Design a protein around this ligand. Structure first.
Ligand SMILES: [Mg+2]
Ligand code: NI
Ligand code: NI
Lengths: 242, 252
């Protein structure tokens, strides 16, 4: 059963918020961290920067930039956060791309309304070349920029916590059937869902030796959160027919 | 923005250095900027404690940013104060920039403690040789207080200042003032804040020198500030300092 790729995780974190921190170079080559807001143009952060802000000047002088993005978290342990560095090169777009970048920024950051059309604020789009993902504790990987651009953000992740808890609170019995008949543990006595994404559900199952982890895939990947309902109903039905 | 109807004696306001120190102390997460070994700017999520204003990091020697620091110890960190406001541009933020150094001896032990106190899970990493303690020697500061003021400061000014003991812990107090002391806030606006024509007053900030008030006046919405009778230095002193404010407001 397929799992989101690092590229997908990265896209998903990017799409989870509109704030991060840009790293740029001063003219002397010192590393400069700046708070920034952004929208996305197919996975690409779109910044609206004042030309006299330190980071606007940095980009104009050396357009190498990276942005670290942190997914909003329920967990109060910061080290459990899901986070990503998108690194490459920022460029001021033109023409059609500029108009689309502008729009994407505007609908992700309402207040940019008041800045984006002054001639002394510029729109930058970060051409992502490299990606480093850290998915909380002990999950990490790198990807290429092309893999990142090819991937899609997960439409289930943003509302997964609620879905997960609802499944555990009200569907423990269906979760158990899935584990027994689809997940490879016919004798487990208890199954808890520990994650949901567009490909399937992760299950923690009781064994005589502790717990095991299995995964059950939907009939096929889903494309919106509203399809999760039908996907779990089909999972429960397929489990009874085994 | 309508002006005060009457003059008020200037109220002490935290300095940019103090604001910067206060933002730093408001949380234990930020983002480090370092140089890769090929000179690219690298942004990393990090956790930190403070040693007299100085971020203390605990970094894996095999993490990209650990390897960056070992090679070139120039670093900066951006820190964003936790906010109620959902408009990110209203956020208070700061960049602390300088040079990171692995401390030794007494300083290392104090750095270690400070990091541990601020980040519970660092418990499981900080004594292992794979992880190093770094302290950021702050040389310059850029502060952006929301839509409000912005300014730069020197590292010495930053080191000399103190974090506000009230502001980071004021959310409950602020809300209690707004929910239960509308009358007192109103009287302060009218009699001490320069806006006798205030009809409603809301406290939008509290710090160790005084309270910021947003006022609904017959002429529209305005902003003022009222100062304690003297600065305070601990949160438990806030109640008594706001009571004296209310009393001074009734006495004209
Ligand atoms: Mg321009
Ligand atoms: Ni249900
Ligand atoms: Ni009170």
């Amino acid at each position: 059963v397929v799992r989101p790729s690092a590229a997908e995780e990265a896209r998903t974190i990017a799409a989870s918020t509109n704030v991060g921190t840009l790293a740029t170079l001063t003219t002397e080559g010192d590393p400069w961290a700046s708070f920034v807001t952004y929208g996305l143009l197919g996975g690409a952060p779109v910044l609206c920067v004042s030309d006299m802000a330190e980071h606007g000047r940095n980009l104009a002088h050396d357009p190498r930039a990276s942005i670290a993005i942190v997914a909003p978290s329920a967990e109060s342990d910061p080290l459990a956060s899901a986070r990503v560095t998108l690194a490459g090169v920022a460029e001021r777009p033109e023409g059609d791309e500029l108009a689309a970048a502008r729009a994407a920024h505007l609908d992700a950051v309402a207040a940019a309304k008041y800045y984006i059309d002054y001639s002394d604020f510029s729109v930058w789009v970060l051409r992502v070349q490299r990606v480093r993902w850290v998915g909380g504790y002990g999950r990490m990987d790198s990807t290429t920029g092309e893999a990142y651009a090819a991937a899609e953000a997960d439409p289930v992740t943003p509302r997964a916590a609620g879905a997960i808890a609802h499944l555990n609170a009200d569907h423990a019995d269906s979760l158990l059937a899935m584990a027994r008949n689809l997940g490879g543990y016919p004798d487990t006595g208890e199954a808890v869902c520990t994650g949901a994404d567009r490909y399937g559900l992760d299950l923690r199952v009781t064994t005589e030796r502790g717990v095991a982890y299995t995964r059950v895939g939907y009939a096929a990947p889903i494309s919106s959160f509203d399809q999760l309902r039908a996907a779990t109903v089909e999972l429960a039905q397929r489990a009874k027919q085994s």
